Amino acid sequence: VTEFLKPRLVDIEQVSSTHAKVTLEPLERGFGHTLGNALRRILLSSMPGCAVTEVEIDGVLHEYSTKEGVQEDILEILLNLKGLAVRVQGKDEVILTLNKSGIGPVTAADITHDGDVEIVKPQHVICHLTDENASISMRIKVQRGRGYVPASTRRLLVDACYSPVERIAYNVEAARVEQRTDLDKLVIEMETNGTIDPEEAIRRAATILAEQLEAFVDL
Amino acid sequence: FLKPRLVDIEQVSSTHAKVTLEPLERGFGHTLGNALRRILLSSMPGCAVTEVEIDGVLHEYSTKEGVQEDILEILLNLKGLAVRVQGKDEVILTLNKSGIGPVTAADITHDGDVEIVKPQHVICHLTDENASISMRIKVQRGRGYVPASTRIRPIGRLLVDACYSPVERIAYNVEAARVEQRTDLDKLVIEMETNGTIDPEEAIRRAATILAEQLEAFVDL
Amino acid sequence: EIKELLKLGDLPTSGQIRLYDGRTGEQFERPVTVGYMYMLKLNHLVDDKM
Amino acid sequence: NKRPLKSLADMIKGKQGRFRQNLLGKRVDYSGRSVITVGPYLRLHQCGLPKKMALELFKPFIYGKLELRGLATTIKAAKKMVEREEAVVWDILDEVIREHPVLLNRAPTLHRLGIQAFEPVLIEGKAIQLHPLVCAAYNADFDGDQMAVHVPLTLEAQLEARALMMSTNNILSPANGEPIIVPSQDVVLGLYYMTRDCVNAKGEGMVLTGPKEAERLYRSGLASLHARVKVRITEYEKDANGELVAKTSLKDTTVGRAILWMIVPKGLPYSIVNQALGKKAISKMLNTCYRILGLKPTVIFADQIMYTGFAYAARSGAS
Amino acid sequence: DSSLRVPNGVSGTVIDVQVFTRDGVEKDKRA
Amino acid sequence: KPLVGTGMERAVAVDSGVTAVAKRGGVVQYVDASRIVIKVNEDEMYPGEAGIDIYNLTKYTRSNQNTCINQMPCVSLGEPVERGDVLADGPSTDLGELAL
Amino acid sequence: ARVTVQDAVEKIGNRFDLVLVAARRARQMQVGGKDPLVPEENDKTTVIALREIEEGLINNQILDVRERQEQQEQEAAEL
RNA sequence: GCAGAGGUUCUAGCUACACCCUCUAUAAAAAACUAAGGACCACACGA
Ligand SMILES: [Mg+2]
């Protein structure tokens, strides 16, 4: 009576490394929704990840302001920063500087290493400069958070998307292995900022969920 | 992260209890509560009756003299009794009653392992002086609800729809815990309602085992 | 009279309560109307129509 | 019974006469009826259909496949096998329903779109499942409404049903250019609730990287579905000679309107999802999508918009 | 081979079988 | 029974022939799923040929629309019964109230 | 599998001759031993004919000239 | 396997929509098998 139809991977369509679509055919009735919602919440609200949380402009102190020589407002400048996918080592916090001048876009590859900090998107655009004398420089603060911490709950404060996932949507339709009941067919499409593989991110979320029930496994 | 534990099990009543899990953070509370509730309500191994044979009743819709109600209502009352077994996966319950008086589940000639958790559950009322009903109740374990029309011999055998579901109402509440020194910790209390055939602690533990094993489809231990 | 009858029990006088999703598990905003209405079952069963 | 007895002219004239009863429109084989069911999980190119109905309608096809595969030597043995509903018969049945359209047909076929083709999806049950979008085209309710299913037999019949009668091929009603598969009753309510705004809602004010971040905030529950927040969108326009150019800007909007942006195809502009999105707005949206993107993107967009409307109407709890 | 058969699809259990036989012809064992 | 109704369900059930109303009051000497025996009271019975009332409830019977006309007893042994009272819950009937 | 025949009708701008040509193609595939040029994906003849038309290599002119050539080598078979 | 008969079963089985083998005036070594009929008027109800 304790036996269950454990799912087996059948075809995982590997979209470009920032996107994936993982599905399971067998599973159980009503278990598709359970697993889909559990994974979605568990990796969308609590995941160990690194993201920007606080930015300081050397020449700007108030948000309702803008530097000369940049066509993007600092409101939009922080918008690019919050999407900057960054992976860090055992250090829980590091300050990232972006001392750069001259005419041209400020790609994420121009961020100073400041150790072994890795940027998975060197070509990511942060801001554009159009004046030779114009210089942009800011300090970036990142921490290994455990979910999403909006700026409304707390110097320029930028929304911190610590979790590496960008979008989760599970669709549960019917799959009949052999000729049984209409068992759930969980298909999960996932998009990740790039710090970890979407498959690796789902595996990490499942490890977290099972590791949450270590004492509940009947020894 | 933090590990929930069986901090408390408030057995408020004989049927339904109030289990408590203490250490949980943002999301975990609601996620784990909803997952546990869905696992419990979906697939919990019950021991509901599935097959009844009456001594002298040919089919499901006939009626024997001396019984208050129809045989169909007798079968539907039999489906309502809560019975749990320990050793045998399959057990046959013999009910022999005579004389005027309601036929409660207490008079079932139970075996060593099988025992009725609600002896007051009435099945039928005998009315005539020389009225005797002798039924052989077949009770087997199972998971979920399977009707008698979607399964798999003598004409005298009566099939009652199987109702293998010990739990009937699972409600969970996520509220802040009372840890020694910490914030953003919530406790999950589950107000699970059972017919009495399952222990709430073992029910929660088995549901969690099912959930954990379902996660092993792509994750090693 | 109906409002007073709801107030007699623990149920709210508004007649509609917050419901949590069966799958997602988070409550529906704009609490929905629930109640025990007497609804029949007509003899136009699908079994006859195939 | 003291009634006029039918003559040699009473059977050539009138409703019951040979012409209008047996020549103009005549009863047909390979036909079945049942009440209809919503089944929102379907796509409008397909419909649900009971196993018994697929077994009975496609009996000659099942017999042919059994003879071809040698499961039954003779039609007679194969017919007995179909009666036994042996498991091998269901696997054979799934092969003859892969790309075999059936003509869903409501009884009062007032106009051309009354009968449409569908790829049957084998469902367990006894009620035909009709796609929610095509209910408006069928003028079909879910209150005991029954519609017949006809099975095209020849390659010409199935092929022309697929090419013409498919609900994917019937988006604009013959009466007028306006779309006929427009979100009608419930999905439109879900979209309308989605595309609104509180003047003070949870998670209002912060700037969002894109629709993905809007979905992340809504699902996590830390931002209301409809809160006025500025988002960054990659709006695609085909102002070039068929090439789609990308325009990125911070358009003030709500979270709910940002959710729909990932649903709409690339070509559509953002000005069409930035309103309350009532029935007329959605009709205009679908018409613009058909006139710009084409047919297949319009079909995919209609399916996705139906999915999101139903899902967020369920999440809305609009009691 | 004209025996009465249950229609396809419908099922259930027989509750009673009543037989009416005209006078003159001998009734079978079940009658 | 319907939780919300009109109060005419009892009137419709009693007036219709689906239920087994008690022509004479008394006490239920013997009740069975197929028969109900009513012991008529001394002040409600005729001097001659009164005896006691016997009600043979109709068991599962084929109906015009292929439904079951089932009558289940609504009383137990020794329950007093007055004149014009409901005794058997016919089809779609509960406690003498029309329960469709 | 296929859902719509739009690109096919931009390939064949009739919406009616398309049915005729794909029906002839399906007839060739079923009655004859003709091998579909696009490899099937567990697809029926009536939809693989539309797949063939979609790639543009099969229409009325190519089908007609192909069957004409087959008839030509049918006369030439006996020399 | 196209006009008939026979065969091991079970009266009869020759493609009758129909299932195996033989030949053109002769009957048996052989297992899976079998049947080809059926209107109108009224009532009520559903969309
Ligand atoms: Mg209707």
Swiss-Prot record, chain A:
Subunit structure: Homodimer. The RNAP catalytic core consists of 2 alpha, 1 beta, 1 beta' and 1 omega subunit. When a sigma factor is associated with the core the holoenzyme is formed, which can initiate transcription.
Region listing for Alpha N-terminal domain (alpha-NTD), in residue ranges: 1-219
GO MF terms, alphabetically ordered: DNA binding; DNA-directed RNA polymerase activity; protein dimerization activity
GO-annotated cellular components: cytoplasm; DNA-directed RNA polymerase complex
EC number(s) stated in the UniProt entry for this protein: 2.7.7.6
GO biological process, one term: DNA-templated transcription
Keywords for this protein: DNA-directed RNA polymerase, Nucleotidyltransferase, Transcription, Transferase
UniProt keyword annotation of Transcription present: yes
Catalyzed reactions per annotation: RNA(n) + a ribonucleoside 5'-triphosphate = RNA(n+1) + diphosphate
Interval of the full protein contained in this chain: 5 to 234 of 329
Source organism per UniProt: Escherichia coli O1:K1 / APEC
Protein name: DNA-directed RNA polymerase subunit alpha
The record's note on its domains: The N-terminal domain is essential for RNAP assembly and basal transcription, whereas the C-terminal domain is involved in interaction with transcriptional regulators and with upstream promoter elements.
Family: Belongs to the RNA polymerase alpha chain family.
Primary enzyme class: transferase
Function summary: DNA-dependent RNA polymerase catalyzes the transcription of DNA into RNA using the four ribonucleoside triphosphates as substrates.
Positions of disulphide bridges: none
From Swiss-Prot, chain C:
Subunit structure: The RNAP catalytic core consists of 2 alpha, 1 beta, 1 beta' and 1 omega subunit. When a sigma factor is associated with the core the holoenzyme is formed, which can initiate transcription. The rRNA transcription and antitermination complex (rrnTAC) consists of RNAP, NusA, NusB, NusE (rpsJ), NusG, SubB, ribosomal protein S4, DNA and precursor rRNA; S4 is more flexible than other subunits. In pull-down experiments interacts with CedA.
Function summary: DNA-dependent RNA polymerase (RNAP) catalyzes the transcription of DNA into RNA using the four ribonucleoside triphosphates as substrates. Resistance to the antibiotics salinamide A, salinamide B, rifampicin, streptolydigin, CBR703, myxopyronin, and lipiarmycin can result from mutations in this protein.
TM spans (from-to): none
UniProt record similarity statement: Belongs to the RNA polymerase beta chain family.
Protein name in the entry: DNA-directed RNA polymerase subunit beta
Post-translational modification: Acetylated on several lysine residues in the presence of glucose.
Biotech use, per record: Co-administration of salinamide and rifampicin or salinamide and myxopyronin suppresses the emergence of resistance to both antibiotics.
N6-acetyllysine PTM sites in chain numbering: K7
Curated annotation (Swiss-Prot), chain F:
PTM notes: Acetylated on several lysine residues in the presence of glucose.
Reported uses of this protein in biotechnology and industry: Co-administration of salinamide and rifampicin or salinamide and myxopyronin suppresses the emergence of resistance to both antibiotics.
Domain of life of the native organism: Bacteria
Protein family according to the UniProt entry: Belongs to the RNA polymerase beta chain family.
Subunit structure as annotated in this protein's UniProt entry: The RNAP catalytic core consists of 2 alpha, 1 beta, 1 beta' and 1 omega subunit. When a sigma factor is associated with the core the holoenzyme is formed, which can initiate transcription. The rRNA transcription and antitermination complex (rrnTAC) consists of RNAP, NusA, NusB, NusE (rpsJ), NusG, SubB, ribosomal protein S4, DNA and precursor rRNA; S4 is more flexible than other subunits. In pull-down experiments interacts with CedA. (Microbial infection) Interacts (via flap domain) with Escherichia phage lambda antitermination protein Q; this interaction renders bacterial RNAP resistant to transcription pausing and allows it to read through termination signals.
Protein task: DNA-dependent RNA polymerase (RNAP) catalyzes the transcription of DNA into RNA using the four ribonucleoside triphosphates as substrates.
Name of this protein: DNA-directed RNA polymerase subunit beta
Organism: Escherichia coli (strain K12)
Lineage per the UniProt record: Bacteria, Pseudomonadati, Pseudomonadota, Gammaproteobacteria, Enterobacterales
Gene that encodes it: rpoB
UniProtKB/Swiss-Prot annotation, chain G:
Pfam families cross-referenced by the UniProt entry: RNA_pol_Rpb6
One of the record's GO cellular component terms: DNA-directed RNA polymerase complex
Example GO molecular function: DNA binding
Keywords in alphabetical order: DNA-directed RNA polymerase, Nucleotidyltransferase, Transcription, Transferase
NCBIfam families from the UniProt entry: rpoZ
Subunit description: The RNAP catalytic core consists of 2 alpha, 1 beta, 1 beta' and 1 omega subunit. When a sigma factor is associated with the core the holoenzyme is formed, which can initiate transcription.
Protein's name in the database: DNA-directed RNA polymerase subunit omega
Species the sequence originates in: Escherichia coli O1:K1 / APEC
